[PDB]
Design a protein around this nucleic acid. Structure first.
Ligand SMILES: [K+]
Ligand SMILES: [K+]
Ligand SMILES: [K+]
Ligand SMILES: [K+]
Ligand SMILES: [K+]
Ligand SMILES: [K+]
Ligand SMILES: [K+]
Ligand SMILES: [K+]
Ligand SMILES: [K+]
Ligand SMILES: [Mg+2]
Ligand SMILES: [Mg+2]
Ligand SMILES: [Mg+2]
Ligand SMILES: [Mg+2]
Ligand SMILES: [Mg+2]
Ligand SMILES: [Mg+2]
Ligand SMILES: [Mg+2]
Ligand SMILES: [Mg+2]
Ligand SMILES: [Mg+2]
Ligand SMILES: [Mg+2]
Ligand SMILES: [Mg+2]
Ligand SMILES: [Mg+2]
Ligand SMILES: [Mg+2]
Ligand SMILES: [Mg+2]
Ligand SMILES: [Mg+2]
Ligand SMILES: [Mg+2]
Ligand SMILES: [Mg+2]
Ligand SMILES: [Mg+2]
Ligand SMILES: [Mg+2]
Ligand SMILES: [Mg+2]
Ligand SMILES: [Mg+2]
Ligand SMILES: [Mg+2]
Ligand SMILES: [Mg+2]
Lengths: 352, 139, 190, 109, 201
RNA sequence: ACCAUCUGUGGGAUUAUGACUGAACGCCUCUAAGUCAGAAUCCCGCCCAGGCGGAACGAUACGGCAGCGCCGCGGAGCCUCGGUUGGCCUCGGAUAGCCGGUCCCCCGCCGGGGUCCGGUGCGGAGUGCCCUUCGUCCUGGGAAACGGGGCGCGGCCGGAGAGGCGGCCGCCCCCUCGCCCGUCACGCACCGCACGUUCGUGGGGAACCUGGCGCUAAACCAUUCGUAGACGACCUGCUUC
RNA sequence: ACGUCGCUUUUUGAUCCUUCGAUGUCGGCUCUUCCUAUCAUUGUGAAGCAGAAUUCACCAAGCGUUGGAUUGUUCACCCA
RNA sequence: UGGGCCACUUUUGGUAAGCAGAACUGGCGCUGCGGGAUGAACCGAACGCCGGGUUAAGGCGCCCGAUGCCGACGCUCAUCA
RNA sequence: GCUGGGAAGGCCCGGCGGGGAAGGUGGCUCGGGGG
């Protein structure tokens, strides 16, 4: 018979394999749609969740109770040291999907990047890309490299650049860098290859990717919670105290027929460490990071034109469970998935 | 668009059935599916015949509908269809298809020899024409 | 019952010529060129006269449903002749009780702006079909003149305007406001 | 210096829908797609030639891995050029959809 | 036969072509069907779309990941139609199904090879001209297929390269006809032999 | 912890319905052919997972005899799996229509159109085409001689949808042979008999000898980390500035 | 209205085919899914549709359909 | 053995029932086989172990033996055929 | 072999004729075309 009173189901079935993420970085899964009218630009970046704080700003929203009124707003600091471009990938559209056409890697790949290619860098002999870098110098290799670029220019529809983060600028224990394919949008394939080729081995600061007060998407892996019951995992109703064999359960996991437990029923399992993408995160500030021209300049990080205090974004005593933020940072509005020092992917909004 | 029409006096070629390979003249039409059919000089006596086994030719005889076999034969003989038919490409492809089927093993061997020489002489001359036409030096 | 032959002939004027490419009629009158295919109908099209220019449509062994297509093709062809010789002009009146319907014609008569339909603030943007030009008449206060060569396109452009100004959630018998096709006619009046 | 045999396919056994008579096989001969054309092949010797692991004696030759199950065409099956064949031993089911040679040996022409 | 049979799917009715292909693979023949997006189905499009949407509804209520797998590519749609005409749960049927290769468009292995046609499954002869039909490519596109546009662009590229080949083939044939006229005195001896036996009318 | 805070999205075909043109039914008609708009529905996108499903790329094992890769069909052989018994190297397509060829016009020397000429029960035809195998020896006539064949080298071009393929030159090294019609004889002619005849130097696995060109790595455990965690698994670090 | 044709298996009967070497027998709680004969919401047609409100009907099950007093209640009734 | 049950037709009660009760013949029970996808009772046909030929009822796009006939004449479009 | 001792049909311009017509030939009339 029908359930006596209606009630919406607990949890969403759009996230059903409520499983540990197969990846730690958080992949883009969807780059902004490319139109050649726009200038050549990058669509993604990698940052590290440093910590949270709150700000005071003035709201310019007409018709609102907070118009011309001070508000405070929780913000997340994502440390974003510059990318290093170390390769280019070309893709060709096929009736079976996109397939990788050809990959060209730059000469002089940094050690932190080369650590990604090894599971035991200690016992390794650092041989990765040792024979590949020689083709950038001999004449047969350079001709073969030029053919690869020409073939990409005439057969590939979308290209991407392999860029890695800079561990040694971070305060973390990890020295292994994070590599991501970042799509290049806005232009002809020839134009975006020429753009990518001249950025090989170079640094791309977060300024050249994102701008002030624009809405971006944050892609990452949520905090792990281990193995959890239905009450925490699916937020089902706790059973009455008088329940014999346990109250943190779902009382009925299905009817007699269909004679199986359905995929829609709340059941205990992993909670957290799930891949998630949150859209519409506003950039409240892009911080300059520490500089040395004659002396250590730390002002720009947390000084406002009203504040005018020589203070960094770093809280007093440091960001808890992270360290000290020294490089560029993006100040996002609100909360962001992941623990502290968790690598985050920042992607341009797919929406208008 | 249409050039060949079912009509009285239209000569049709029988594609299959008991009278396959014969020429007949359409004397009258019945019920859209069949026609009164008579070939007096091709040994097909007057009888009904479906339009499905007919293939219309380009020859049209002049006689009134449902005329007697004598008048159809006179129209068939005057400006005789038998010689005109045999001179068409349609008929001599039928004849060529017939003699190729009756070709014996010895004839197959001699055709294989003649075709071999003919193709080598032709394909030689094709190469010569290609090589000659390859000499194009002009702005 | 299958009828042996159902045929009908249209008479082509002297100043317009018709060219057939299978079941594709190309009409080349003084006002332009109209082209439309009829490959969805299994008929035979023939140009008959070198002097009077007759076009004959024939259906062989047709049932009742597909004899109805013989005159449909002829009527469509006659509209092509009419369109390329005289053109098609649709006059639309904007009727209203209280709020006057303000019509602004944008680029080259291809966009129509309806402002104050029933006093609401939403702006109606109706795009004319290609080859159809809309204009505000200088004779009567509230007219729109839709001019073009294809009756299909001109009439459908007029229907787009009429259906845009639709009263909703009210009694349509009382709230009669809107833009309606007043008359259907030609240009050059011949 | 030539194929000298007609290509045929072991389509299956003579059967009802739910009963299979393995003693006789239905062969599809290439190029014979009507019943009136099967007259030539009636009584013709047919062979299922296959290979195995161990060598077997070859008549007029050194032992090799080739084996053969001989048979002959018995009659026509259906209206579309199938023929029925009897082999000295019932054809293995692994040969369905594989080559059967029709020898032309007992020639009536 | 022992060679692969490459069939062009354009203008062919879905079930009628599948029945022919199913018996061919059961007879040990390797069949390749290309241009599965050009396959037609009798009946108006809306009706045929409703049939697939009804197919989409059939899923295991308990666990759809185990339930019927609904393939949206025209090649896989045709593949499933053939699979419904084979004993695919036996080893003989699985062997037959593995002899069938289905493609959207015409991939590079078969784009340079001549493609066969099955008249008994052709829309022009099997369907009355006044009846309505549906394109498998359109039906697939509007029910989940994602590669209708890219396949169209690649098919247009293939057609442009094929036209160049046909012009070279026609130029070669014109040269051959001119060659036959040029060497006619030294050919009539062998021409006559061909004519007496029905070759070269 | 709505007991604090942040974020939650685009398109397509269309339903109902309202219409256009328009016959049927010289009028009318949203319908018959043909069109338009159209939604919490439907499908897809965004988002979650990622196939007994693919791709691109990197590095690929010694300081001692020690493993491996490529090039040679280089050889002698083993174990195992068997199928097959010439090829077709491609217009796009229409079907109440098609195909081929040619002069003017327009597109930067070929296509694209307009004439004109042919074919159409498809003969520039898949009911088709190509190749065609007994081998040699004397020996003439024709075809050719602007020829053939080199796993001979070297260079280049085209092909990306799965290009795994195809083509063109330069030099070199050989036959005047090979294709048709004839002369001339010979070859085990194994004494009527089956699995013969090909792909094929087939695929796969160990192993020996033989030359050249080359390479000298990782993964896992243990330890550590705690962005992770029931255990597995996962993120990390471990003589250099 | 008088008549008359159906559908449904959320009522209650009728029957006794399965189960008496045993299929745990009401209600509530919890939780999932499904149906549509649609209460609301989206898009519509109709009116004895001026507006507001309401009623009838169509496509339509995407989404929602609650807190309580009395009663073991299912039902019921009232408060909001 | 003395629990029967089913089908054509006749037939009583009942709104009806895969309900209850009779008549007649056949069947299932006691019975396999071909066909009806599947099924005690329907249709064909009843059975020692086999080879060949032919059929019954039923079929001959493919599953799956058989129309791969140049089968005949019409009817029918269904956005729940 | 039988049948309506087959029905039709073919040839003999079937000949002396008669009658009937129409899915109407020639001719004539009206309406549309090519020198
Ligand atoms: K319940
Ligand atoms: K062999
Ligand atoms: K009941
Ligand atoms: K009971
Ligand atoms: K019991
Ligand atoms: K309760
Ligand atoms: K209560
Ligand atoms: K007794
Ligand atoms: K007794
Ligand atoms: Mg409810
Ligand atoms: Mg208790
Ligand atoms: Mg009219
Ligand atoms: Mg109202
Ligand atoms: Mg909350
Ligand atoms: Mg409508
Ligand atoms: Mg529309
Ligand atoms: Mg029990
Ligand atoms: Mg129990
Ligand atoms: Mg139980
Ligand atoms: Mg409903
Ligand atoms: Mg008893
Ligand atoms: Mg008793
Ligand atoms: Mg009873
Ligand atoms: Mg009883
Ligand atoms: Mg008993
Ligand atoms: Mg008995
Ligand atoms: Mg029995
Ligand atoms: Mg049975
Ligand atoms: Mg049944
Ligand atoms: Mg028997
Ligand atoms: Mg059956
Ligand atoms: Mg069969």
């Amino acid at each position: 018979s029908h359930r006596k009173f209606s009630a919406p189901r607990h949890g969403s079935l759009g996230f059903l394999p409520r499983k540990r993420s197969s990846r730690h970085r958080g992949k883009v899964k969807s780059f902004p749609k490319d139109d050649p009218s726009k200038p050549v630009h990058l669509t993604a970046f990698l940052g590290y969740k440093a910590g949270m704080t709150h700000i005071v700003r003035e709201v310019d929203r007409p018709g609102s109770k907070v118009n011309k009124k001070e508000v405070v707003e929780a913000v997340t600091i994502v440390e974003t040291p510059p990318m290093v471009v170390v390769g280019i990938v070309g893709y060709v559209e096929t009736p079976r999907g996109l397939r990788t056409f050809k990959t060209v890697f730059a000469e002089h790949i940094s050690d932190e990047c080369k650590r990604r290619f090894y599971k035991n860098w200690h016992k390794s002999k650092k041989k990765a890309f040792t024979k590949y870098c020689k083709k950038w110098q001999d004449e047969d290799g350079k001709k073969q490299l030029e053919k690869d670029f020409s073939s990409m220019k005439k057969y590939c529809q979308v290209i991407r650049v392999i860029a890695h983060t800079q561990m040694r600028l971070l305060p973390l224990r990890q020295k292994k860098a994070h590599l991501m394919e970042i799509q290049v949008n806005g232009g002809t394939v020839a134009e975006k290859l020429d753009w990518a080729r001249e950025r090989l081995e170079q640094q791309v600061p977060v300024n050249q990717v994102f701008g002030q007060d624009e809405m971006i998407d944050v892609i990452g892996v949520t905090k792990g919670k281990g193995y959890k019951g239905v009450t925490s995992r699916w937020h089902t109703k706790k059973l009455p105290r008088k329940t014999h064999r346990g109250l943190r359960k779902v009382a009925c996991i299905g009817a007699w027929h269909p004679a199986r437990v359905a995929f829609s029923v709340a059941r205990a399992g992993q909670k957290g460490y799930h891949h998630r993408t949150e859209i519409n995160k506003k950039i409240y500030k892009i911080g300059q990071g520490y500089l040395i021209k004659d002396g250590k300049l730390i002002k720009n990080n947390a000084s406002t034109d009203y504040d005018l205090s020589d203070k960094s974004i770093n809280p007093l005593g440091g960001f808890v469970h992270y360290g000290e933020v020294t490089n560029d940072f993006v100040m996002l509005k609100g909360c962001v998935v992941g623990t502290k020092k968790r690598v985050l992917t920042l992607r341009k909004s797919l929406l208008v | 668009v249409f050039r060949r029409f079912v009509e009285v006096g239209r000569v049709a070629y029988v594609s299959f059935g008991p009278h396959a390979g014969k020429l007949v003249a359409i004397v009258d039409v019945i019920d859209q599916n069949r026609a009164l059919v008579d070939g007096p000089c091709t040994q097909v006596r007057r009888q009904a015949m479906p339009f499905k086994c007919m293939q219309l030719t380009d020859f049209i005889l002049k006689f009134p509908h449902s005329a007697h076999q004598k008048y159809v034969r006179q129209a068939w003989q005057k400006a005789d269809i038998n010689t005109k038919w045999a001179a068409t490409r349609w008929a001599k492809k039928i004849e060529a298809r017939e003699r190729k089927a009756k070709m014996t093993d010895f004839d197959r061997f001699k055709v294989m020899k003649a075709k071999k020489m003919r193709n080598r002489i032709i394909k030689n001359e094709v190469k010569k024409l290609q090589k000659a036409a390859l000499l194009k030096a002009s702005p | 019952m299958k009828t042996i032959l159902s045929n009908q002939t249209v008479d082509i004027p002297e100043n317009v010529d018709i060219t057939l490419k299978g079941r594709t009629v190309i009409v080349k009158g003084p006002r332009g060129t109209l082209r439309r295919d009829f490959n969805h109908i299994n008929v035979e099209l023939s140009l008959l006269g070198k002097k009077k220019k007759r076009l004959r449509v024939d259906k062989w062994w047709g049932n009742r449903k597909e004899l109805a297509t013989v005159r449909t093709i002829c009527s469509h062809v006659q509209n092509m002749i009419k369109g390329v010789t005289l053109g098609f002009r649709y006059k639309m009146r904007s009727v209203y009780a209280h709020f006057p319907i303000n019509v602004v014609i944008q680029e080259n008569g291809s966009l129509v702006e309806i402002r104050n339909f029933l006093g609401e603030k939403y702006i109606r943007r109706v795009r004319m079909r290609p080859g159809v030009a809309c204009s505000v008449s200088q004779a009567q206060k509230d007219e729109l003149i839709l001019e073009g060569n294809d009756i299909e396109l001109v009439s459908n452009s007029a229907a787009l305007i009429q259906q845009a100004t639709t009263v909703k959630n009210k009694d349509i018998r009382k709230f009669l406001d809107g833009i309606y096709v007043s008359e259907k006619g030609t240009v050059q009046q011949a | 210096s030539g194929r000298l045999w007609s290509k045929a396919i072991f389509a299956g056994y003579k059967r009802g829908l739910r009963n299979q008579r393995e003693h006789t096989a239905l062969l599809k001969i290439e190029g014979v797609y009507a019943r009136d054309e099967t007259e030539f092949y009636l009584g013709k010797r047919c062979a299922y030639v296959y290979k195995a692991k161990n060598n077997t004696v070859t008549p007029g030759g050194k032992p090799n891995k080739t084996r053969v199950i001989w048979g002959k065409v018995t009659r026509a099956h259906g209206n579309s050029g199938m023929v029925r064949a009897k082999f000295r031993s019932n054809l293995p089911a692994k040969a369905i959809g594989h080559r059967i040679r029709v020898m032309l040996y007992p020639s009536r022409i | 036969e022992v060679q692969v049979l490459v069939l062009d799917g354009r203008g062919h009715l879905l079930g009628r072509l599948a029945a022919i292909v199913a018996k061919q693979v059961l007879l040990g023949r390797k069949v390749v069907v290309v241009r599965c997006e050009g396959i037609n189905i009798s009946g108006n499009f809306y009706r045929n779309k409703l049939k697939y949407l009804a197919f989409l509804r059939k899923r295991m209520n308990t666990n759809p990941s185990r339930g019927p797998y609904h393939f949206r590519a025209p090649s896989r749609i045709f593949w499933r139609t053939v699979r419904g005409m084979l004993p695919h749960k036996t080893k003989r049927g699985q062997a037959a199904l593995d002899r069938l290769k289905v493609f959207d468009g015409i991939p590079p292995p078969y784009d340079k090879k001549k493609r066969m046609v099955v008249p008994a499954a052709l829309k022009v002869v099997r369907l009355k001209p006044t009846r309505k039909f549906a394109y498998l490519g359109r039906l697939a596109h509007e029910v989940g297929w994602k590669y209708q546009a890219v396949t169209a662009t690649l098919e247009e590229k293939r057609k442009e390269k094929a036209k160049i080949h046909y012009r070279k083939k026609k130029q070669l044939m014109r040269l051959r006809k001119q060659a036959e006229k040029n060497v006619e005195k030294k050919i009539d001896k062998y021409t006559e032999v061909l004519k007496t036996h029905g070759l070269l009318v």
